[PDB]
């Protein structure tokens, strides 16, 4: 079938455009906190099975199966230590602006999902890690949590089911690396926030040495609606192994940048000229698209003309869905400049703990700065490819891979453009002697 053209009834986030009050009154008017007592009455194993059968996958940029991952949590703690559920509300991936909309429009959905998931994994408390740049969103979520306490939905007799659940907000400062799960836990535990060496995994030893799980806002927020609607309803949308709806944020050189919600595995072009008003100057004016966050490698128009928007489809063409962030570029865009700015972003956000990332981010930026102006060699492109392959897959965490991928995509798609720039520079700038000293500082 032709995926897309979702009905308004099947939207989960009906408050995304601020058509009602986001607080407890509007949340009850929209159906939040409805029949939650009946949900908590069933055993946690039933909730785990329902999430597994729903086919929901992580929306944080990985795509792991949420139900199985939640099932990884231990069933009992002989030590008496508690279990913690952590909501990854940190969002610093360039191009992605969806969880901000969720928090500032539908906070009670997040709270209800947190309660349901924590009950499913038998967790005592829930810590929501919001970035410091989301000041307004943090205030709104805190007010919603206060209302939830005042209405007796969480804490002490949470929904009158005998379970104790506290929801807390931990506001973190500016750091992209704090989005990584172990780095997030280290940031909560009064530390810098550097990622840990795994194994061990947070399912065994996480926050404070207790079992912990880290999950995105979107999955938690859609869990209660999935539970009420049913697993089959969620699985009825999208391709197999790509079930459910998805929030797409589109920005850049498109006519109508916006955030929408649509059935997963939707065609890319059909999405753009259905919701975002088409590419500026027409489809022929398109140069490249980044299907996910800045971590995902960029795509050329050749595959953008036909590719669908999901995990497997974007992975089969040398990309990934990531966080469903769509960046569109016109023919007036300089790909080298955009990728250089992305590399400069990744250079500033490295935590500096482990060697390959800490040196390779700076080396990549320094090489790309010369590649932009043409003051380079034809072999420097291959050297950069080799340097990226050395950085990736050798580091403590997955940020090194995220820094390596965009440069590899840029090389693979516009080696000819890079060569043309270098050729023009060397044709306009004759030079015979080669300096034995280092390159001038930029």
């Amino acid at each position: 079938r032709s995926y897309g053209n979702l009905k308004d009834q099947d939207r989960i986030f009906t408050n995304l455009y601020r058509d009602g009050d986001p607080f407890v009154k509007g949340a009850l008017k929209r159906g939040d906190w409805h029949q939650t007592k009946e949900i908590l009455s069933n055993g946690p194993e039933w909730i785990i099975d329902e999430i597994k059968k729903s086919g929901l996958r992580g929306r944080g940029g990985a795509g792991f199966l949420s139900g199985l991952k939640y099932s990884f949590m231990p069933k009992v703690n002989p030590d008496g230590r508690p279990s913690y559920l952590v909501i990854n509300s940190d969002e610093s991936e360039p191009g992605t602006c969806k969880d901000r909309e969720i928090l500032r429009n539908d906070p009670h959905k997040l709270v209800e999902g947190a309660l349901v998931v924590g009950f499913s994994m038998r967790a005592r408390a829930a810590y929501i890690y919001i970035r410091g740049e989301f000041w307004v969103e943090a205030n709104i979520l805190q007010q919603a949590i206060d209302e939830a306490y005042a209405k007796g939905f969480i804490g002490k007799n949470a929904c009158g089911s005998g379970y104790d659940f506290d929801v807390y907000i931990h506001r973190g400062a500016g750091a992209y690396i704090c989005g990584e799960e172990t780095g997030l836990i280290e940031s909560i535990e009064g530390k810098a926030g550097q990622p840990r060496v795994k194994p061990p995994f947070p399912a065994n030893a996480g926050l404070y040495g207790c079992p912990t799980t880290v999950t995105n806002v979107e999955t938690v927020a859609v869990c209660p609606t999935i539970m009420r609607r049913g697993a089959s309803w969620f699985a009825s949308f999208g391709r197999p192994n790509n079930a459910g709806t998805k929030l797409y944020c589109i920005s850049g050189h498109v006519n109508n940048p916006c955030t929408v919600e649509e059935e997963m595995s939707i065609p890319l072009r059909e999405l753009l000229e259905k919701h975002c008003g088409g590419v500026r100057g027409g489809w022929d004016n398109l140069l490249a698209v980044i299907p996910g966050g800045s971590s995902v490698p960029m795509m050329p128009k050749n595959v953008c003309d036909d590719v669908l928007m999901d995990f497997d489809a974007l992975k089969a063409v040398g990309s990934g869905l990531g966080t469903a962030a769509v960046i569109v570029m016109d023919k007036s865009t300089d790909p080298i400049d955009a990728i250089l700015r992305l590399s400069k972003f990744y250079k500033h956000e490295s935590c500096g703990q482990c060697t390959p990332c800490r040196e390779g981010t700076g080396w990549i930026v320094d090489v790309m700065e010369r590649l932009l102006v043409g003051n380079a060699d034809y072999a420097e492109i291959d050297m950069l490819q080799q340097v990226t392959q050395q950085i990736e897959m050798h580091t403590i965490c997955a940020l090194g891979d995220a820094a390596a991928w965009p440069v590899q995509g840029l090389i693979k798609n516009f080696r000819e453009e890079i060569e043309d720039r270098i050729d023009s520079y060397h044709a306009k700038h004759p030079q015979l002697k080669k300096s034995r000293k280092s390159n001038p500082q930029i």
Partner: protein, 257 residues
């Protein structure tokens, strides 16, 4: 008690071992910079990366437990490539300081580069520069040479019991040391020099005077305190040049005052 394989030779170890411990006990030498036999396990450097089948990514030998039936290939070409890449990244920002560095002739960076690295460089940009700090008349600092190995921080926290050292900053511009101008005043302070693999921290009294190859060593015991610390005396001709600790495990462990 599990059976593993190191370069094709079967071996029997305990299930609690790390790959590095098994390799060392079986006579296999793995390069390292941040791992120390008495401090906590850190995995910040990556020079101990090895190659294991059915595991796509290289695995850090020091910070990974052994698995029954696994095979470690320390002599494959993939391990050579891993070590070369890590050495390249380590030497990208290292200063050209060997003639003026007191670590020359006994630097682990030099020997590891010579034995395992590619042997030549291609980095042609400005390196980072770090201003030196003052820690007192016993420890001399040249912080351009630091590789952020955390050995000094772990030694100060876990062995000396003082909490004055740390890592402030982020990324490539992060710096190791005290935030404010403060001396590293403590007993067992000079020991931190022996912990640091590079010439970042050096013996300030033993500054520029000698080189490792022109010294003769003797084993003896100390009398300055009633613990008979096992010590090594390094001399050049009729002049005693320095004193180093030894290993006893019943006296002074590894350390001297």
């Amino acid at each position: 008690q599990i059976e593993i394989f190191i370069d094709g030779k079967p071996a029997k170890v305990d299930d609690s071992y790390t790959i590095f411990q098994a390799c060392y006990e079986n006579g296999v030498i793995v390069p390292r910079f941040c791992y120390h036999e008495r401090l906590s396990v850190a995995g910040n450097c990556r020079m101990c990366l090895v190659e294991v089948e059915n595991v796509p990514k290289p695995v850090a030998a020091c910070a990974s437990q052994v698995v029954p039936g696994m095979k470690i290939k320390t002599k494959s070409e993939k391990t050579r490539i891993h070590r070369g890449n890590v050495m390249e990244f380590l030497l990208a920002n290292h200063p050209l300081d060997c003639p003026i560095c007191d670590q020359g002739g006994e630097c682990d960076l030099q020997d590891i580069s010579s034995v395992y690295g590619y042997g030549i460089s291609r980095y042609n940009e400005y390196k980072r520069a770090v201003e030196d700090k003052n820690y007192g008349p016993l420890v001399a600092t040249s912080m351009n040479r630091c590789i952020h190995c955390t050995r000094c921080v772990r030694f100060a926290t876990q062995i000396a019991g003082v909490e004055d050292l740390g890592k402030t900053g982020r990324g490539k511009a992060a710096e190791i040391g005290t935030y404010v101008e403060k001396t590293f005043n403590t007993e067992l302070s000079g020991n931190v020099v022996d912990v640091c693999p590079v010439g970042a921290l050096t013996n300030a009294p033993y500054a520029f005077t000698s080189r490792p190859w022109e010294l003769k060593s003797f084993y003896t015991s100390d009398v300055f305190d009633t613990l008979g610390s096992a010590i090594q005396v390094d001399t050049r001709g009729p002049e005693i040049m320095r004193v180093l600790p030894r290993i006893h495990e019943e006296i002074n462990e590894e350390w001297i005052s």
